[PDB]
């Protein structure tokens, strides 16, 4: 669709195919990103692959817009013209795309695997749009890390309260606690379909897991489990709504002798009313999570 470039908010119709989140990029910013990094796939309204009978070229400097579609170097219609050239990448709204350098921090944000620690300290001290894009791609990478996990199966059941576990040979084994769930398969002939939502926890003796389920299906030995995925939605809203300082309390109303216990935090309640958003920082067990209930009793 027609969208807005991430780092300059110009109009655009291009996206980076190699990026996990597929972000919109204007012409200048897309050229700066693709000519310097290893990303070489750009999706317009139609993807920029070469439209031969069969050809697989994706690098954008190799391609041309020939005839009525995108064609590679030796498949092009004899009439050209180059796509990735003149300091830009050909897309919609071509002559209105103006960005800024932050194409030195965006390269690092797009390329980094979020393994080191400096990636986070650059993903949180950058500009405001990059603060959203970096969070989006970090969530996407955290989700796609689960794709490298090992799927289970059941050995047998001597005790129906403690499942037996069997991991697939040649893959890592996920930790057993409450945070991770699983969903099954019965792929014998005969129902490659889920069999419920289960969860696991280890047993003290031998090899066993004292499982839990959302339903009460049993596993004939072929039935097994895989940890479930989660597509990450666009980081649609800003991280912090911009602050405005009202002259007086708007939308909120005080109370008549709130209590004899919350009488100290009254000034902070009024300050909360004045500002759009407020931050309360205090050492633990000083009255923070009780301040909120006092606020409720005040409004």
């Amino acid at each position: 669709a027609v969208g807005a470039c991430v780092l300059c908010n110009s109009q655009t119709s291009l996206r980076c195919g190699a990026c996990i989140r597929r972000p919109f990029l204007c012409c200048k910013c897309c050229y700066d990103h693709v000519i310097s990094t290893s990303h070489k796939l750009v999706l317009s309204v139609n993807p920029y692959v070469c439209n031969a009978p069969g050809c697989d070229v994706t690098d954008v400097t190799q391609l041309y817009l020939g005839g009525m579609s995108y064609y590679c170097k030796s498949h092009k219609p004899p009439i050209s013209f180059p796509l990735c050239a003149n300091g830009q990448v050909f897309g919609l709204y071509k002559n209105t795309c103006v960005g800024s350098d932050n194409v030195t921090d965006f390269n690092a944000i797009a390329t980094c695997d979020w393994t080191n620690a400096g990636d986070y300290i650059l993903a949180n001290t950058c500009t405001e749009r990059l603060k959203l894009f970096a969070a989006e791609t970090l969530k996407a990478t955290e989700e796609t890390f689960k794709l490298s996990y090992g799927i289970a199966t059941v050995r047998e059941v001597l005790s129906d309260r403690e499942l037996h576990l069997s991991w697939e040979v040649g893959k890592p084994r996920p930790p057993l606690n409450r945070n991770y769930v699983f969903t099954g398969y019965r792929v014998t002939k005969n129902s490659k379909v889920q069999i419920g939502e289960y969860t696991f926890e280890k047993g003290d003796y031998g090899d066993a897991v004292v499982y839990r389920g959302t339903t009460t299906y049993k596993l004939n030995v072929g039935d097994y489990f895989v940890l479930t995925s989660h597509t990450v939605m666009p980081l649609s809203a800003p991280t912090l709504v911009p602050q405005e300082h009202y002259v007086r309390i708007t939308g909120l109303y005080p109370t008549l002798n709130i209590s004899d216990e919350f009488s100290s935090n009254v000034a902070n309640y009024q300050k909360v009313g004045m500002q759009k958003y407020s931050t309360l920082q205090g050492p633990p067990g000083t009255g923070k999570s009780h301040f909120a209930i006092g606020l409720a009793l005040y409004y």
């Binding site: 109009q11 919609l92 709204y93 071509k94 002559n95 209105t96």
Partner: protein, 795 residues
């Protein structure tokens, strides 16, 4: 004539058909507003049938007495007795001859209007006794048909073939089919349709149709039937998938009480209720229009054409209108002369079979019908079949009958009335062969200028003026006339559709044999006339009438229209007195017309040419498939020598089972105003250049509704569709010559909206970029000369 029907009322009252207050109903005569009139007319049936029996006695009494004489209807009272022996001459006894040619033939439309043979469905032919329980597996009623013919039409001396596969030509197919129409009303409705048989291919038993039982054509058997096969080619796979034998034999039994039509099967496990969406509102164009002074209170131009939405009970409520198709037995001695005159009308064209490489298909991205739409469009089946196995399929259809399922598709289009419109999606197996059979003649009709059938004649570049000047082809006292066919495609009798198909097939006198033409007609009837209809996942039986999706739809409709007009002229000329006709030429023409109808069995080509010349001279026509403009002689029509509106009303009453109200039929006494309406276009005479020409203008409501309401969400953007409004302005140009200014402002509204659309399109394009388009030739679409040249005869 509903204004003068006093003998019909008296006959109905005196024989206890109704109660003399039945006529206090507003439209008691109307077949579609008051279907109960059928029940009234059938109360005469047993009085008619007894009369028939009396005739067969009287004929015998003449034959055994040696008395020669002509039997006329006016010598038999309604009891059935005979009393006029003035023109009876006696010969040697045992060798008399009653001449019953005009007796039976004039009576024939009444034998089915009154359902005279309903006593033959009862045991021992007694209306009190219960119905005959025929064996369900029985399908061959040839002996029963022969017994019926020998019992009622005994001295009708032309040979009757119960199965029309034995007829000698198409003049014999019509005669025997006309008798079969009557005789098929006394047989169970389950005995007609395809005749299936269990065959084996590679050892597995299929059930496939090896024949058909037509109500009009009798029993037809296939000639190429392979009981044991090993492999199915693509052609044979297409044939076995097209026919309804396997689909009906595998589906569930159906009892649909929503219709009176025969329900065959339910293919799925649940009924589908297809709805129709409302239109999409172009709010930008409507705001622009109301900013220009449109749609005010009391204005002459107002929105009347909308997209009407339909509920789930629409497709089965439209199909139920086939309840207006009744079995109509025609006057055969009259239809057989009307056929000759219509063939004279279609003499300037050429036709015949073409090869598969000579067939041109307009749009290949169109539906292939059931079941072929489950795997692709018509492009898939025109690509997957080589020319060799398309010619093989076409040659298969000349020796075998292929039944075919036609879908009923709800139509999503703009209209002025809220009744749903349905089209018939015919299978590709039928459309392909019908194209290969008829397309040469059909393209020959569409390429002829100046004929009666104006198909392929454009209305642009002076085409409307040329059409209107050819209609006024030297008629003496010209009046224009136009009529309407109520429920035209659903009330058309099967005899007239068969007549149209036989008239179209007269061009195959050298390419096809007699059996080839019969099996092509049988395929037409099995796939078009009386087929299996898919309506919401369920197979029903179509009682008759033309389907609007066959290859030859507009052209067969034109043949039907010309046939009805010629019949109206014949009835007008014969029902005139004859002692009042002052012109001695027309009196002799009436005498010879009666001779060629009821006293001649061989075609008199000289008189057919003479009557064709008379009709062209005094009853000039212009036909587009159900629209017709006539430029008749007003003096002859006032004297009754040429058809009037009342003659069309009478003919449509006794030959279409509809009532044509004179509120939908117009007459124009002044030729300088042109036809009141033809093809939904009014006509006005304008001074173009230096000479006066006829220009067609549409309903301004239609063009405004097309601008305001669309059938897609992206036709609402406007800048995406500027050609959409250029075409509408082309259609709305002649409104600028209208004397009403509110009509003339529609064209200027469209031009101003085109200019605004281009302005904002260039603005949006310059925003999406920073450069204007180099080449822009859109400026000519808001200049009125581009549209003025659209109606100028230089091209």
């Amino acid at each position: 004539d509903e204004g003068n029907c006093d003998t019909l009322k008296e006959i109905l009252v005196t024989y206890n058909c109704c109660d003399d207050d039945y006529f206090n109903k507003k439209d008691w005569y109307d077949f579609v507003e008051n279907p109960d009139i059928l029940r009234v007319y059938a109360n005469l049936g047993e009085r008619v049938r007894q009369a028939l029996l009396k005739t067969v006695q009287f004929c015998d009494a003449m034959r055994n007495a040696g008395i020669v004489g002509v039997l006329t209807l006016d010598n038999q009272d309604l009891n059935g007795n005979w009393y006029d022996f003035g023109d009876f001459i006696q010969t040697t006894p045992g060798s008399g001859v009653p001449v019953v040619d005009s007796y039976y033939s004039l009576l024939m439309p009444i034998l089915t209007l009154t359902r005279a043979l309903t006593a033959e469905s009862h045991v021992d032919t007694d209306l009190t006794k219960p119905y005959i329980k025929w064996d369900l597996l029985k399908y061959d009623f040839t002996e029963e048909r022969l017994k019926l013919f020998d019992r009622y039409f005994k001295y009708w001396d032309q040979t009757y073939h119960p199965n029309c596969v034995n007829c000698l030509d198409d003049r014999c197919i019509l005669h025997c089919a006309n008798f079969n129409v009557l005789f098929s009303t006394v047989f169970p409705p389950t005995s007609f349709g395809p005749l299936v048989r269990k065959i084996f291919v590679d050892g597995v038993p299929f059930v496939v149709s090896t024949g058909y039982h037509f109500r009009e054509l009798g029993v037809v058997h296939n000639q190429d039937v392979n009981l044991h096969s090993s492999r199915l080619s693509f052609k044979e796979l297409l044939v076995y998938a097209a026919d309804p034998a396997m689909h009906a034999a595998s589906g569930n039994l159906l009892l649909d009480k929503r219709t009176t039509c025969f329900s065959v099967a339910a293919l799925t496990n649940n009924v589908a209720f297809q709805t129709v969406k409302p239109g999409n509102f172009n709010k930008d164009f409507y705001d622009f229009a109301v900013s220009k002074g449109f749609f005010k209170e009391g204005s002459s131009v107002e929105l009347k054409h909308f997209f009407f939405a339909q509920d789930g009970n629409a497709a089965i409520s439209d199909y139920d209108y086939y309840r207006y198709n009744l079995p109509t037995m025609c006057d055969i001695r009259q239809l057989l002369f009307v056929v000759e005159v219509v063939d004279k009308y279609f003499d300037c064209y050429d036709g015949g079979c073409i090869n598969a490489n000579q067939v041109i298909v307009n749009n290949l991205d169109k539906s292939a019908g059931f079941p072929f739409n489950k795997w692709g469009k018509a492009r898939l089946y025109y690509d997957s079949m080589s020319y060799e196995d398309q010619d093989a399929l076409f040659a298969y259809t000349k020796r075998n009958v292929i039944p075919t399922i036609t879908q009923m598709n709800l139509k999503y289009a703009i209209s002025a009335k809220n009744r749903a419109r349905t089209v018939a999606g015919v299978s590709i197996c039928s459309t392909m062969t019908n194209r290969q059979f008829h397309q040469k003649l059909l393209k020959s009709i569409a390429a002829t200028r100046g004929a009666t059938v104006v198909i392929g004649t454009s209305k642009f570049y002076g085409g409307w003026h040329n059409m209107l000047k050819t209609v006024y082809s030297d008629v003496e006292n010209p009046h224009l006339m136009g009529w309407d066919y109520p429920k035209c495609d659903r009330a058309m009798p099967n005899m007239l559709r068969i007549m149209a198909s036989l008239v179209l097939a007269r061009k195959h006198t050298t390419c096809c044999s007699l059996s080839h033409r019969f099996y092509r007609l049988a395929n037409e009837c099995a796939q078009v006339l009386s087929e299996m209809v898919m309506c919401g996942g369920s197979l029903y039986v179509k009682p008759g009438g033309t389907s609007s999706g066959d290859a030859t739809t507009a052209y067969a409709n034109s043949v039907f229209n010309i046939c009805q007009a010629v019949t109206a002229n014949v009835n007008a000329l014969l029902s005139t007195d004859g002692n009042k006709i002052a012109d001695k030429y027309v009196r002799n023409l009436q005498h010879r017309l009666y001779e060629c109808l009821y006293r001649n069995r061989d075609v008199d080509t000289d008189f057919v040419n003479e009557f064709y010349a008379y009709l062209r001279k005094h009853f000039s026509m212009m036909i587009l498939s159900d629209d017709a403009v006539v430029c008749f002689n007003s003096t002859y029509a006032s004297q009754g020598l040429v058809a009037s509106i009342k003659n069309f009303k009478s003919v449509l009453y006794y030959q279409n089972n509809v009532f044509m109200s004179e509120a939908k039929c117009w007459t124009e006494t002044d030729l300088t105003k042109g036809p009141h309406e033809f093809c939904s276009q009014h006509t006005m005479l304008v001074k173009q250049g230096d000479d006066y020409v006829y220009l067609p203008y549409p309903d301004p409501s239609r063009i405004l509704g097309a601008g305001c309401f669309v059938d897609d969400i992206v036709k609402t953007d406007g800048t995406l569709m500027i050609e959409r409004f250029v075409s509408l302005a082309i259609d709305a140009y002649p409104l600028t010559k209208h004397p009403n200014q509110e009509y003339a402002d529609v064209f200027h509204l469209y031009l101003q909206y085109i200019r605004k659309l281009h302005d904002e399109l260039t603005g949006h394009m310059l925003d999406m970029y920073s450069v204007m388009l180099t080449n822009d030739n859109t400026s000519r679409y808001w200049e009125p000369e581009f549209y003025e040249a659209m109606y100028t005869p230089h091209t």
